[PDB]
Amino acid sequence: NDKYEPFWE
Amino acid sequence: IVEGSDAEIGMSPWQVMLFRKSPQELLCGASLISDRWVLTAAHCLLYPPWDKNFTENDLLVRIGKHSRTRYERNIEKISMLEKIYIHPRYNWRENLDRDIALMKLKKPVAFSDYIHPVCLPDRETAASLLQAGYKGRVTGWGNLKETWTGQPSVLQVVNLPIVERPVCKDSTRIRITDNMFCAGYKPDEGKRGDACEGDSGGPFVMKSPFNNRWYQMGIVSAGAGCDRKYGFYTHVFRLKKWIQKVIDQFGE
Amino acid sequence: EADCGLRPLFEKKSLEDKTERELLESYIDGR
Ligand SMILES: *[C@@H]1O[C@H](CO)[C@@H](O)[C@H](O)[C@H]1NC(C)=O
Numbered sequence: 001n002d003k004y005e006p007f008w009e
Numbered sequence: 010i011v012e013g014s015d016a017e018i019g020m021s022p023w024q025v026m027l028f029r030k031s032p033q034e035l036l037c038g039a040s041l042i043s044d045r046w047v048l049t050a051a052h053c054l055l056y057p058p059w060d061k062n063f064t065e066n067d068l069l070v071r072i073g074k075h076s077r078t079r080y081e082r083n084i085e086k087i088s089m090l091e092k093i094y095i096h097p098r099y100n101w102r103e104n105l106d107r108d109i110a111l112m113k114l115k116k117p118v119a120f121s122d123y124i125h126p127v128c129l130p131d132r133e134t135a136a137s138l139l140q141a142g143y144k145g146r147v148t149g150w151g152n153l154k155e156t157w158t159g160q161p162s163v164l165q166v167v168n169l170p171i172v173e174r175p176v177c178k179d180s181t182r183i184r185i186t187d188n189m190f191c192a193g194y195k196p197d198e199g200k201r202g203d204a205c206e207g208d209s210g211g212p213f214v215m216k217s218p219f220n221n222r223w224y225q226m227g228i229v230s231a232g233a234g235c236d237r238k239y240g241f242y243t244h245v246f247r248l249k250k251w252i253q254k255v256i257d258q259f260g261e
Numbered sequence: 262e263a264d265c266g267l268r269p270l271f272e273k274k275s276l277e278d279k280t281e282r283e284l285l286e287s288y289i290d291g292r
Contacts, residue, residue, distance in 0.1 A: 002160065004033050007080035008087055019270035020278045043262055121269070128266035144287035146280075168283050216284050222266030 010149055011235055012202035013167030018075060021148045022125035023225075024164060026071040027053060027210060028087075029063075036063075038149040038211025040225055041072055041126050044117035046256055049210035050228050050243065051099040051110040058101070065090040070114065073123035075163050077150045084123055089115040094255050096248065106186045108230040108243050110210075111255050127212060130224045135246035138215045138226060141173040145192060145215045145226055147240075151207030155235045160207075167202045169193055169213075172239050180239055188247045190227060193239035203240055204232030213242050 016024075025039035025047050037053035047070055054063045074085045091113045100106035118124060130138070138145075148166045152159050169192040172180075177191035185191070192213065194200045204211065213227035227242030234240065245252075267273055282291070 005080040126265045
């Protein structure tokens with residue numbers, strides 16, 4: 001795969 | 010980007026990442042031209058041949074990033090899209106003529122050491138700088154090597170020279186309009202360096218010796234990228250009146 | 262706008278990046 005680090009607010 | 014290198018911190022503060030909400034992935038590049046407006050390529054959003062028609066809710070823009078995958082908290086900024094504006098005469102059936110789009114953010118973004126708008130060229134600047142041989146800069150998180158069928162860890166930068174219109178015309182079967190221009194070294198030069206598909210929509214900038222400012226002369230429309238030829242860019246100044254029309258009519 | 266094109270960690274600090282000169286040399290010819 002290729003995961004992007006969770007984020008936001 | 011192929012044959013480029015890691016961009017320094019804040020070296021391209023206007024660089025924007027078009028992020029696909031789901032599946033979560035890099036969609037394209039883009040640029041910040043004001044606290045509420047992001048400029049990108051139209052083909053990144055719209056392309057019926059492959060029934061691609063992203064709506065505001067399918068995307069997010071991430072500003073001020075360096076690392077491609079990490080959530081750079083207290084550095085990058087994530088914004089939602091209020092509206093998308095594909096140029097009305099974007100020719101996707103023919104040759105991506107007028108391959109350009111505008112995106113209005115929901116809320117204005119605050120500038121920082123990592124977030125800063127790029128300038129759009131005026132007539133003189135375009136006249137002075139858009140000459141064969143002069144070099145502009147390209148940045149993006151696109152692929153690194155020929156798509157074997159790879160990805161960079163951090164934003165990639167590379168400089169490329171503008172190609173003479175005729176030379177470029179003779180290099181492809183595509184009808185290159187006056188709303189596009191080409192960049193890239195000659196195939197013999199062995200001095201490679203180019204933008205790949207993931208870099209499309211990103212900016213092609215030039216630093217003006219007249220005022221020390223960076224201007225976006227083009228948008229990566231179709232880089233001769235990770236291909237086995239020159240890259241094609243949207244002529245920003247030629248499409249300047251449309252850009253201002255949109256930003257003036259829409260937007261506060 | 263107005264303040265566009267001037268990088269905080271570069272133009273504003275009077276610092277240059279490792280390759281912008283390649284650009285300027287292309288407009289003049291650096292020899
Ligand atoms: C994209 O889909 C929207 C939302 O469903 C629709 O209004 C529009 O016709 C589509 N875009 C085009 C021109 O294919």
